[PDB]
Ligand binder design. Sequence first.
Ligand code: 4UK
Ligand code: 4UK
Ligand code: 4UK
Ligand code: BOG
Ligand code: BOG
Ligand code: BOG
Ligand code: BOG
Ligand code: BOG
Ligand code: BOG
Ligand code: GSH
Ligand code: GSH
Ligand code: GSH
Lengths: 148, 148, 148
Amino acid sequence: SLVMSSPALPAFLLCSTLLVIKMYVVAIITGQVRLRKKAFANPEDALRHGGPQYCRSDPDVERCLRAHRNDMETIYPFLFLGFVYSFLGPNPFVAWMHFLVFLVGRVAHTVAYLGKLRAPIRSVTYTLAQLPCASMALQILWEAARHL
Amino acid sequence: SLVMSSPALPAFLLCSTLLVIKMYVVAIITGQVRLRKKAFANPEDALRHGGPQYCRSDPDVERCLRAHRNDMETIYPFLFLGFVYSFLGPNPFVAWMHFLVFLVGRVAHTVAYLGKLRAPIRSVTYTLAQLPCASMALQILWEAARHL
Amino acid sequence: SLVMSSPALPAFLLCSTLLVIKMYVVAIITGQVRLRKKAFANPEDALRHGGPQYCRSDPDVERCLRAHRNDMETIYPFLFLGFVYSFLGPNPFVAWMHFLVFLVGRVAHTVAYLGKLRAPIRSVTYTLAQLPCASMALQILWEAARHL
Ligand SMILES: CC(C)C(=O)NCc1ccc(C(F)F)c(C(=O)Nc2nc(-c3ccc(Cl)cc3)c[nH]2)c1
Ligand SMILES: CC(C)C(=O)NCc1ccc(C(F)F)c(C(=O)Nc2nc(-c3ccc(Cl)cc3)c[nH]2)c1
Ligand SMILES: CC(C)C(=O)NCc1ccc(C(F)F)c(C(=O)Nc2nc(-c3ccc(Cl)cc3)c[nH]2)c1
Ligand SMILES: CCCCCCCCO[C@@H]1O[C@H](CO)[C@@H](O)[C@H](O)[C@H]1O
Ligand SMILES: CCCCCCCCO[C@@H]1O[C@H](CO)[C@@H](O)[C@H](O)[C@H]1O
Ligand SMILES: CCCCCCCCO[C@@H]1O[C@H](CO)[C@@H](O)[C@H](O)[C@H]1O
Ligand SMILES: CCCCCCCCO[C@@H]1O[C@H](CO)[C@@H](O)[C@H](O)[C@H]1O
Ligand SMILES: CCCCCCCCO[C@@H]1O[C@H](CO)[C@@H](O)[C@H](O)[C@H]1O
Ligand SMILES: CCCCCCCCO[C@@H]1O[C@H](CO)[C@@H](O)[C@H](O)[C@H]1O
Ligand SMILES: N[C@@H](CCC(=O)N[C@@H](CS)C(=O)NCC(=O)O)C(=O)O
Ligand SMILES: N[C@@H](CCC(=O)N[C@@H](CS)C(=O)NCC(=O)O)C(=O)O
Ligand SMILES: N[C@@H](CCC(=O)N[C@@H](CS)C(=O)NCC(=O)O)C(=O)O
């Protein structure tokens, strides 16, 4: 199997795929909030589900959208950085720690966001998860630059 | 050519690249709607195109932005999942069906969204396209986990 | 090192990683604008930083969010397209020019957006950066199609 291409790759693929699934969960939650609170973004949706007055914004829907957007701002770069980083021959344990800190930090971020936890819990989880990303980005820069 | 690395890869690259181009088309449409309806997001844009009153929201522009955002929420994960999945030695026909269902579902989604088709047509296309993504995600999880 | 897999790859990884870092910079700027202008998206954030009246929108924050969103609409597809393109054996110089035009165009875009430069400077930088992306997308299409 081509998952064996590098020692850190299986760990990366596990964490990344779990995070993609976590984003899918956020999308499902968003839909449920829209349906249960009757807050739709489109008139065609609202008309099917009770009338035009239900094409409206809702604070909980907006919160779900913010969590999903923050995921797109952070998890998508990780998908790129972590994949490339897996092929740079990092220490296996060190690589696992990068991926695990990101995974735990991002899951905690979504819990803090959707659960409306007190500040600065969410902000802290964002920063903690960004640390391994910054680390990987720098390592990739050095490897790329030295092969120019 | 390195497109021959795995039997499913060419099909994946065809569908993915078509979907990226489809997102570029949505961006172009959005710009055209802004210009034709004179609804700009920035005062500097509005001042060049008729005056400050044209820095304003428009329902059609907002709809275009929602379609593009939904694309980012779904197509970007597919770019990751489908690429990895291509290297897990899936049955070629089964892989093609995953990619084709996603491609058709997503093109239909954009048509349903921008064309303002009645509910739940758009919602159905979203769910149909998510099915192969969920399938690939699970398969990657198993492959990654078993190589830990 | 696996950065040597193709002659264009190191250049791609350098430009892509710089652009990811540039997006991280936009996120940091956004946070600074929120804190300094006291414009938070969440009541929990506002309550920690002065009171509920600071859960409010701000034009500079919204501008930062637009720049970041435009980055997600353009840089993320480049991460995919440029990676695949690196493995299609393009002329090394031609590949470098694709990556450099994208890098310069996107950095200029962020400067034009956040710096509130007169129209159509930002629009021009967007279009200039999209050119190499369109070029790579077409080249990938041909390579993928011919291997079907
Ligand atoms: C995460 C998504 C799925 C979500 O929750 N979104 C909330 C939402 C918003 C608006 C609408 C409606 F206005 F269009 C609907 C709706 O009525 N959807 C709907 N889908 C089916 C469906 C899908 C697949 C299949 Cl095989 C069969 C039936 C029926 N109804 C749902
Ligand atoms: C998908 C994009 C392209 C789109 O439609 N956006 C709508 C839009 C919004 C705001 C503005 C304006 F306010 F800044 C403009 C505008 O006047 N753009 C503009 N670009 C050129 C251009 C570009 C490349 C080249 Cl080589 C030559 C000339 C001229 N004008 C356009
Ligand atoms: C780009 C990000 C970082 C940014 O600027 N966002 C603006 C912002 C918005 C809201 C809040 C607050 F309401 F939650 C805060 C805030 O007080 N954050 C905060 N982080 C720490 C922190 C982080 C890591 C560590 Cl190891 C230690 C302490 C403290 N305070 C910041
Ligand atoms: C991967 C998806 C994680 C979902 C985390 C959702 C956490 C929900 O947490 C809930 O939040 C509510 C406020 O929103 C509170 O009223 C509840 O006390 C709390 O249980
Ligand atoms: C608040 C400041 C944040 C700093 C970001 C932490 C990133 C550290 O990243 C580290 O950088 C070193 C030098 O490039 C590398 O040698 C290490 O491999 C890398 O882990
Ligand atoms: C990849 C991009 C696909 C573009 C699909 C746009 C479909 C446009 O479809 C149009 O929508 C209008 C409402 O918006 C209707 O008034 C028109 O009858 C319909 O033709
Ligand atoms: C409404 C419920 C949605 C279920 C998502 C469909 C995903 C099915 O995906 C399937 O999962 C199996 C078990 O992991 C795998 O063996 C198959 O290879 C895979 O195609
Ligand atoms: C990668 C991040 C690039 C940051 C570019 C920010 C450019 C800031 O530029 C500033 O913009 C202000 C208006 O916003 C003007 O008042 C100032 O004259 C100008 O210096
Ligand atoms: C305004 C029109 C924009 C056109 C997009 C420019 C993309 C050009 O891209 C070019 O396309 C050729 C034909 O497919 C290829 O042979 C070249 O390798 C490629 O660089
Ligand atoms: N787009 C972000 C940029 C900065 C950021 O990512 N901040 C973190 C830590 S405070 C966050 O959780 N932001 C909330 C959000 O993006 O909605 C924002 O507007 O806040
Ligand atoms: N961000 C989405 C999450 C759920 C989702 O993706 N729903 C599908 C099917 S109803 C959709 O097309 N959403 C419309 C949109 O994202 O604007 C939303 O707000 O609706
Ligand atoms: N989502 C974009 C689609 C078109 C686009 O990307 N336009 C470029 C050139 S005018 C841009 O810089 N848009 C500003 C933005 O996305 O906020 C929009 O609403 O404008």
